[PDB]
């Protein structure tokens, strides 16, 4: 009961009653606030009323006195099972940076998984393998394993060509006088050098402290 009482859902009712009559009896009421007639026909919505939330999975038909009836349920789709199976067989598929920021939200309007993995708007990712797998597993009546192999093999042949282009593109460019910048391999080693040096300093400093401590620890108070 510490919290204050908010009567915001009754401002129109309260404000309208205060404008029905004038404090000075016998006189006409003054003009009401300019917002009284604006929300005249737009009453608030019912709040603070726990409904039966949407059931995204069949509730336990065995419970005789179940709890958490007014508790939202977890959203689970058939793809959740497949996503976990794929990304576990291909853990490094997660290192491929993927964008989840949406541009307009209409990316699903041009996804026809009957054609193949390559779609419009979305990149070739582990998701394309799952959706393609799900489609075959539903329309063509394939098993989870069979459809997985098919969509999975088409994924490899596309990934191979992308890795082959990088090598052939660079080599081809240099045959005609094309020079590039620092590759990620060299850039990565230079950074390790700068960090390793900082560790050499710390080790050198700490090593000095430990040996100095030993000198002080040993008792050389009297020299004979």
């Amino acid at each position: 009961g510490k919290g204050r009482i908010f009567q915001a859902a009754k401002v129109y009712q309260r404000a309208s009653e205060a404008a029905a009559t004038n404090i000075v009896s016998g006189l006409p009421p003054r003009n009401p606030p300019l917002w009284l007639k604006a929300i005249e026909s737009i009453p608030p919505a019912e709040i603070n009323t726990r409904p039966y939330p949407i059931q995204h999975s069949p509730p336990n038909p065995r419970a005789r006195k179940p709890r958490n009836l007014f508790r939202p349920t977890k959203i689970v789709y058939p793809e959740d099972e497949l996503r976990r199976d794929f990304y576990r067989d291909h853990p490094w598929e997660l290192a491929r940076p993927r964008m989840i920021i949406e541009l307009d939200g209409k990316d699903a309007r041009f996804l026809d998984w009957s054609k193949g993995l390559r779609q419009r708007g979305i990149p070739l990712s582990g998701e394309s393998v799952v959706q393609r797998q799900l489609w075959l597993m539903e329309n063509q009546g394939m098993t989870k394993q069979e459809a997985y192999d098919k969509a999975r093999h088409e994924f490899y042949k596309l990934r191979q060509l992308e890795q082959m282009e990088r090598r052939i593109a660079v080599e081809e460019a240099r045959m005609v006088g094309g020079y590039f910048g620092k590759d990620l391999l060299t850039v990565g080693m230079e950074l390790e050098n700068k960090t390793y040096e900082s560790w050499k300093k710390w080790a050198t400093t700490e090593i000095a402290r430990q040996e100095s401590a030993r000198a002080s620890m040993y008792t050389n108070v009297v020299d004979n």
Binding site: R98, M99, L103, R118, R120, G121, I122, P123, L124, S125, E165, R166, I168, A169, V170, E172, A173, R174, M175, V176, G177, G178, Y179, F180, G181, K182, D183, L184
Partner: protein, 260 residues
């Protein structure tokens, strides 16, 4: 996604009268540019280049060796369209101002013609012949011819992929070979270390490509055939191309300093 934009003066529907057939331009631009863009989309479908124009991709992916395959499709789409955006249905009369600048840098109008055409055939390979406008800090506006290989870019921001001359037939033990070879290693060494050999003005305002010539074989080997016996072929393609150059537009984009 990148989509094919229409051509300048309804060429996809009719094609130039005495230069390219309506079906040749169909296979040269409509069917090919769409193919490149289709490949380009798949490469930048989930990257930062998903909404960047071709030129922005040409300059951003110039030095990065891991994105070299993306630079090709981007520069190829730009260089290709750049070549069609300078033609016209009927030949245009060269401007007096431009006509006088060419003579001051090449001696005569045709002297430049035989130079560009000569460079196209001498190159013997898919590329683009550019007419660049180079202006150094204190130097006047001077023009020159530059040749670019398969997907080379004339802009200075993409000097990492200029691809001006071949290495197989220009780097040997002869006096010219050693010199060319040294420049090859000097560039790669300087580019890698980050050092720049030739200072460039801010904004890449040094070189401004005015005119281009797409010497790729897919554009002429159908209309002009191979060229057995010297009739047609690549030579005739370059010659006929000179008649449709929109010299009016070539003068506008040149932006020659008022000097007369």
């Amino acid at each position: 996604q990148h989509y094919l934009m229409p051509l300048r003066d309804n060429f996809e529907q009719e094609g130039i009268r005495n230069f390219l057939s309506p079906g040749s331009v169909n296979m040269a631009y409509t069917e090919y540019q769409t193919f490149i863009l289709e490949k380009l989309n798949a490469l930048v479908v989930g990257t930062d280049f998903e909404q960047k124009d071709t030129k922005s991709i040409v300059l951003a992916t110039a030095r990065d060796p891991e994105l070299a395959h993306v630079f090709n499709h981007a520069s190829m789409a730009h260089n290709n369209h750049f070549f069609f955006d300078h033609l016209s249905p009927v030949p245009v009369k060269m401007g007096d101002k431009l006509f006088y600048h060419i003579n001051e840098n090449f001696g005569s109008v045709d002297t430049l013609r035989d130079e560009m055409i000569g460079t196209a055939v001498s190159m013997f390979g898919p590329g683009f012949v550019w007419l660049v406008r180079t202006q150094l800090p204190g130097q006047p506006v001077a023009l020159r011819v530059m040749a670019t290989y398969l997907a080379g870019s004339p802009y200075p921001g993409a000097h990492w992929r200029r691809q001006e001359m071949d290495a197989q037939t220009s780097i040997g033990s002869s006096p010219q070979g050693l010199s060319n070879g040294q420049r090859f290693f000097e560039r790669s060494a300087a580019g890698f270390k980050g050092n720049k050999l030739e200072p460039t003005a801010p904004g890449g305002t040094d070189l401004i490509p005015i005119l281009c010539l797409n010497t790729w074989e897919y554009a002429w080997l159908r209309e002009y055939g191979t060229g057995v016996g010297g009739m047609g072929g690549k030579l005739a393609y370059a010659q006929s191309w000179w008649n449709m150059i929109d010299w009016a537009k070539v003068e506008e984009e040149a932006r020659l300093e008022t000097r007369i």
